[PDB]
Design a protein around this ligand. Structure first.
Ligand SMILES: [Zn+2]
Ligand SMILES: [Zn+2]
Ligand SMILES: [Zn+2]
Ligand SMILES: [Zn+2]
Lengths: 230, 224, 232, 230
């Protein structure tokens, strides 16, 4: 299967296994059973922002989700991604809807990754920023029900029970054995919108092997990321 | 064929001198300037363009020397497709010379007019690795030797294109602009090598055209 | 006096001598008499964006002003700033109101300046970005009626009657050019909201570059945009 | 006195008070008695690089110092800078020499600080980079023996017991009560050079109140930062 490191915004009622019986943000390392979680107060129809950061000096992957005029939920996890991920990966977003009609709208998305080498300054860097998606977004690989262009946004899920992913087209070198400091950072703004006020829903920024594709039956609480709940 | 906009560093013996030129769809530069190639020195090339001026400019300098600069008014929206790929290219004549790229960086932005809808792509390589998956190598081009990109084989032709398509312009941007810098080392035992390097912008599926050797820099099929 | 290079958004009625009789954006080099202009359709109460760019390879100073869902006014001028400006300067914004009540609100402001040297990559760079100003904005030098913090914005002009003049300059001197750079360039963007009850306000806003000790010149009210001491 | 948060490269034999008995890199919070240290192998005459990073999601201040073709000494410390530093500060470099002649040369210096607010994208940012200092470097406030321009470098200490500091001119807003994530990052390359092979010496990146100045008698081991060894 795909190796997948992800930061999920999960509102699924999956009081299923290690799953919080409440909406939470969690860090997932190769499994849908989050290695760490924190309670998140989803706000239906509000635009929230997620910031994920990681650097190899700390080896700590962190994420903060906030909504204007509210609190932020933050979650961290010590992990050395060099041991988990392959050197070259693809980064993307993903979402899955439950039995409900709700939309998983991405208003903006940016990412930056850098590899500073120890030989005085050999910095390599990749940075992309989308503040407006277009109908024919060729630097994105869309998977599932995901589409771009409607109002200049990226609709991950079809516009229930939908799954869609968007991955940036160029492979990203997230680490190399020679960097003295490798680090990345991503930010995206999203709008979860549902008529039922308790929608079971999921969005996640993720990092996977470059050929990753939606695994069979990874619907609902598996966020289009995992093939099973193991 | 491919649509190609390029900035060439041409020492091939036709102007009748080494020059840097701006090429729009043809190997016959729309504008040129004399360039003093320095065999074995590391030079830097900066290419910039913005849609407010519609001027594509380039400066090539060597440490402790002069710079050759060249500009050309052109509105790229009329020439290039909206989505392109950017890359470097080089071709050697009958000589053994190397076309070494030590570093390469690029930035492209599309500011929209709806208060700040800026889209951006930026990549920078100060060190290439043996398995450089974000580059598409063509011809004799190879990466990794000493952490460099060897465009030509050590009569060679090689090109390196960044993997992700780039959106160079969109009808709705109030200002679209890009900028590229790359450092290169042209080294040859004969002190007057016929040689060529070029940063270029082409259709995404561009490939080295048949017989685009020597002076056609791996870019053009004929001298038209 | 101060050396001033500015890009003005001028709706003042100086139908005085060669002066455009319409709202224009213009490039001013040391004088309120624009070296070049273009017509601009001010939109009262809308938020507009201005981008100013210059590089030493082209030696062309350009500006575009746009409002969402409209057209843009753009203006350029060939000039080598090395010949006009001192090597170290301060950059800032300025505005002046006429007899009208109107506000000159700056919603955001960013700047970037770089000096690439020719010695393989000796790039120096300064970049600042404000998307929210605060009540005590210490990195800004405020002059005149200008104030920060109301709703996280910069009010250039003051919000009995009469005119107003205010300027905000970034605190750190900026090195705009140095004899050794193979390419020097800067870029600024700011969003503004000009709002007035009269639908034809006489008003003026400008991004400008001056000597580090520049200060509002005496009597530089109204059409002189807080920048110039006289209409010469 | 000044509020000072600093990252030191200390080779002083100051087996003086809590002071390690070996060359170390340490994180100092208001006192010359490092809140945390790590052993550093100083290389006389080589060019080293120092990367300092901090973010308010982890609240961890970290530093790595490496020499080309060598190892790195890294050091971290959990601290929420909001509780220590004032909202507005100035950042700078500092060095002091012992009874020895040695030079503390800074070849390059870059800094970035950001305050992302929570109201969708209200990011404020300050970034400066020096790869070449000039004789009349007006955006720097030079203190003590520090001087710029010799070969395009910054000589913190007097090149002929020396103390010199260089601070960037503009105050920096390091934190504000409303940012969801505040973070900074600094990198600087230095060259310590001495004829004695065990020079007692000290360099430090630091953050202080905007009006900070070299405190009286802060020579030698007090790195031009502290008034006493408390
Ligand atoms: Zn979960
Ligand atoms: Zn030619
Ligand atoms: Zn005017
Ligand atoms: Zn110590």
């Amino acid at each position: 299967a795909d190796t997948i490191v992800a930061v999920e915004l999960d509102t699924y009622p999956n009081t299923d296994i290690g799953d919080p019986s409440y909406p939470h943000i969690g860090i997932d390392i190769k499994s849908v059973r989050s290695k760490k979680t924190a309670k998140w107060n989803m706000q239906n129809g509000k635009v929230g922002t997620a910031h994920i950061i990681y650097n190899s000096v700390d080896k700590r992957l962190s994420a903060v989700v906030s909504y204007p005029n509210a609190d932020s939920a933050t979650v961290s996890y010590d992990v050395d991604l060099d041991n988990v991920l392959p050197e070259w990966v693809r980064v993307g977003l993903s979402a899955s809807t439950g039995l409900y009609k709700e939309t998983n709208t991405i208003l903006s998305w940016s990412f930056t990754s850098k590899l500073k080498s120890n030989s005085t300054h050999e910095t390599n860097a990749l940075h992309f920023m989308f503040n407006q998606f277009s109908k024919d977004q060729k630097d994105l690989i869309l998977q599932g029900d995901a589409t771009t262009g409607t109002d200049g946004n990226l609709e991950l899920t079809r516009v229930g029970s939908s799954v869609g992913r968007a991955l940036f087209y160029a492979p990203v070198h997230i680490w190399e054995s020679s960097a003295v400091v490798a680090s990345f950072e991503a930010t995206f703004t999203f709008l979860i919108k549902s008529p039922d006020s308790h929608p079971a829903d999921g969005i996640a920024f993720f990092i996977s092997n470059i050929d990753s594709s939606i695994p069979s039956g990874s619907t609902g609480r598996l966020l289009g990321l995992f093939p099973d709940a193991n």
